[PDB]
Design goal:
The PDB classes it as oxygen transport. The complex is a heterotetramer, with 2 copies of chain A (about 140 residues) and 2 copies of chain B (about 150 residues). Chain A has about 140 residues and is mainly alpha-helical. In chain A, about 70% of the residues lie in helices and about 0% in strands. Chain B is built from 8 helices and no strands. With about 150 residues, chain B is mainly alpha-helical. Classes of the chains: A mainly alpha (about 140), B mainly alpha (about 150). The complex binds protoporphyrin IX containing FE (4 copies).
Chain lengths: ~140, ~150, ~140, ~150
C-alpha cells in the first residue's frame, strides 16, 4: 500500500514532467521495445522505430493513464477499471511485461529529472508503478 | 548474451566515465531502500533506518564498490560470464541463499543509476546494451541454482 | 480481483480440508523447504526435518491464517494486517517466496483432494493465494 | 541441475506410470485456464471459452502430448538439457517470443498435475526431485534469451 509520503513523492515528481508527459511515455515505450524485444509483438500495427508517430501518440495515452492514476491514487482500481479490462481481456498482456515497462518508466524519469529521482522518490515511484501494474493485471 | 560491436562500444565508452568510488554504493543503497527485504542480508552494516542513513553509510559505499568491481570484471569478459562469476555464485547461492530474482533487481537498479548519472547520454539503445549486460551477470551469478 | 465463483470455489475446496487443516499447512511448508532450499534460512530456530513438531505447529498457524482469509475474503487487507506487518517489517520475507509457498499449497491440495482440484478450482485457488500473497507483501 | 540417484530413481519410476496421452494435455489446458494470457499463443485452437472447452479441446490434448514428449526427452538427458531443447528454445524465444517466466509456470502446472494423479505417492521428496527437473527444462528452453 502507498504511504502518504509515497503519494506526495509521486505527485511531486510527476508534476515536474509538465508538457513532456507524452514525450516521456513514448520514450519509456521505446526503451522497453529495444531492451525487451518480446514486448514488440503486442504492436504489429505500429511501426516501432525511432520517431514513430504511432509510438509518440501511444506514449501520450500511457502518460494520460498514469496521470489519471496519480490524480486518483486512493481509488486506482476504479480509475483504471476500463484499462484493466482492456489489458487482460482483449490484449492478454503477460503480467511480466508490466514490470518491464515500469522499469523503463523509472529509467526515463531518472534520465530527465535527476533532482527528483532521489532514493526515497525512486522507492515511491516503484511502489506506485507496481500498484498500477497490479490493477492492470487484476482483470 | 551477445552484444553487437555498436553495443559493446556504447557500453565500454560509458563505463569509462563511471565514478567507480560512488556508483556501486548508490546502486546497492537504492536496492536496500527500494526493496527493503534485501536489508535482511546486511544486518552488520549498522544504520539503515532511513534512505539518507543508507546512502551515507560508509559500509554501503564500501560494499557497493566491490559490487561495481564485479560488474567491471563482467564487462571485460562478456564471453565468459560463467567462469567470471563462479566463486560469487557459490557465495550468493550456496552460502547466502539470496533469491536470484534479486540479482535481476540489482542489475536494474544499476541501470537506473546509470540513467540518473548520464541523463540524455543514456539513450534507449545504450540502455538496451546495458540490459544485455546486467541480464548476463544475473544469469551467471545464479548458475549455482541451475 | 476474486470473482464470486472464485470465492465459492475456494470456500468449497478449503471446506473439505476439515481436521486436516494444520496437517496440510505443515505438508506445504515441508514441500517448500525441500523443493526450494533458499526458504529454509527463515527458520534457523526450527528443525525442518520430517515429523518436526515445530513445522507441524507452524503449519497450523499458516492454515489458520488462510482460513481467516477465506472467511474474510472481501476484507483480506484488514484481516491479514498484523500478518502483513510481521512478514514485511520484522521478518523481511522476499516476495518471491510467497509464490513458492503458494505453489506448494496447490500441490498439497491436489495431492489430497483430487475431486476438488478441478481446472476451475485450481485457477480460483491460485488467484486466492496470489491475493493473500499481495496482502502479505504490501506492508 | 543435479539430481541425486535417489531423486533420479524416484523421478523415473513415477514417469513410467504417467499416462502419456493425457497428462500433457491436462498440464497445457490448466496453463490456459489458470494463466489466461497464455491463450494469446493458441488462437488457432478454437474453443477456449470455458475450462471444460479448454480441457476437452482435441487440439489442446494433441499439443499437450507434444509438450509431454519434450519433458520425456528431457528426462532421458538430465546432463544435456541445453542441446536437447536447442531447437525448441529457438522456437519459443526467437520465433514465438514467449516470456520465459511462462516456462516456469508450465513446469509448475505439470508438477500440480503429477500431484493430482499420484496423490500420496507424490511425496515431498518426489516433488523436490521433479522441481529440479522442471527448473532444468525451463532454464534450457530459455537459453536463447541468455
Ligand atoms: C504502466 C503500465 C501501462 C499503462 C499505464 C498502459 C496504458 C495504456 C493505454 C492508456 C492504452 C490505450 C487505451 C485505449 O485505447 O483505450 C493502452 C493500450 C495498449 N497497451 Fe498498454 N499500458 C501499460 C502497460 C502495457 C504493457 C506492459 C503492454 C505490453 C507489453 C501493453 C500493451 C498495450 C497494447 C497492445 C495496447 C493497444 C494498442 C492498440 O491496439 O492500438 N500495455 N495501454
Ligand atoms: C549482480 C548482482 C550482485 C553482484 C555482482 C554482487 C557482488 C558481490 C561482491 C563482489 C561481493 C564481495 C565478495 C567478497 O568479499 O569477496 C558480495 C558480497 C555480498 N553480497 Fe553481493 N552481489 C550481487 C547481489 C547481491 C544481492 C541481491 C544481495 C542480497 C540482497 C547480496 C548480498 C551480499 C552479501 C550479504 C555479501 C557479503 C558476504 C560476506 O562477506 O560473507 N548480493 N556481493
Ligand atoms: C500463504 C503465505 C503465508 C502465510 C498465510 C503465512 C502465515 C504465517 C503465520 C500465521 C505466522 C505466525 C504469526 C505469528 O506468530 O504471529 C507466520 C510466521 C512466519 N512466517 Fe509465514 N506465512 C506465509 C508465507 C511465508 C513465507 C513465504 C515465508 C518465508 C519463506 C514465511 C516465513 C515466516 C517466518 C520466518 C515466521 C516466523 C516464525 C517464527 O519466528 O517462529 N512465511 N507466517
Ligand atoms: C516447459 C515448457 C514448454 C515446453 C517443453 C514446450 C514444448 C513444445 C513443443 C514440443 C512444441 C511442438 C513443436 C513442434 O511442433 O515441433 C511446442 C509448440 C508450441 N508452443 Fe510450447 N512448450 C513449452 C512452453 C510453452 C508456453 C508457456 C507457451 C505459450 C504460453 C508455448 C507456446 C507454443 C506454441 C504457440 C507452439 C506452436 C508453434 C508452431 O507450431 O509454430 N509453449 N511447444
Amino acid at each position: 500500500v502507498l504511504s502518504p509520503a509515497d503519494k506526495t513523492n509521486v505527485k511531486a515528481a510527476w508534476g515536474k514532467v509538465g508538457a513532456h508527459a507524452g514525450e516521456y511515455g513514448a520514450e519509456a515505450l521505446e526503451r522497453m521495445f529495444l531492451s525487451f524485444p518480446t514486448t514488440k509483438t503486442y504492436f504489429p500495427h505500429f511501426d516501432l522505430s525511432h520517431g514513430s508517430a504511432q509510438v509518440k501518440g501511444h506514449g501520450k495515452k500511457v502518460a494520460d493513464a498514469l496521470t489519471n492514476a496519480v490524480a486518483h491514487v486512493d481509488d486506482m482500481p476504479n480509475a483504471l477499471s476500463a484499462l484493466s479490462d482492456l489489458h487482460a481481456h482483449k490484449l492478454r498482456v503477460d503480467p511480466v511485461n508490466f514490470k518491464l515497462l515500469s522499469h523503463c518508466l523509472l529509467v526515463t524519469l531518472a534520465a530527465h529529472l535527476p533532482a527528483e529521482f532521489t532514493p526515497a522518490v525512486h522507492a515511491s515511484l516503484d511502489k506506485f508503478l507496481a500498484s498500477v501494474s497490479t490493477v492492470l493485471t487484476s482483470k | 548474451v551477445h552484444l553487437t560491436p555498436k553495443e559493446k562500444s556504447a557500453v565500454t565508452a560509458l563505463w569509462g566515465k563511471v565514478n567507480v568510488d560512488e556508483v556501486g554504493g548508490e546502486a546497492l543503497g537504492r536496492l536496500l531502500v527500494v526493496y527493503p527485504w534485501t536489508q535482511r542480508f546486511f544486518e552488520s552494516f549498522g544504520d539503515l533506518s532511513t534512505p539518507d542513513a543508507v546512502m551515507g553509510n560508509p559500509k554501503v559505499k564500501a560494499h557497493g564498490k566491490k559490487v561495481l568491481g564485479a560488474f567491471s570484471d563482467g564487462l571485460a569478459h562478456l564471453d565468459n560470464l560463467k567462469g567470471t562469476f563462479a566463486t560469487l555464485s557459490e557465495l550468493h547461492c550456496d552460502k547466502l541463499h539470496v533469491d536470484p530474482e534479486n540479482f535481476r533487481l540489482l542489475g536494474n537498479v544499476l541501470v537506473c543509476v546509470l540513467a540518473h548519472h548520464f541523463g540524455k547520454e543514456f539513450t534507449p539503445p545504450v540502455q538496451a546494451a546495458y540490459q544485455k549486460v546486467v541480464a548476463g551477470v544475473a544469469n551467471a551469478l545464479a548458475h549455482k541454482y541451475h
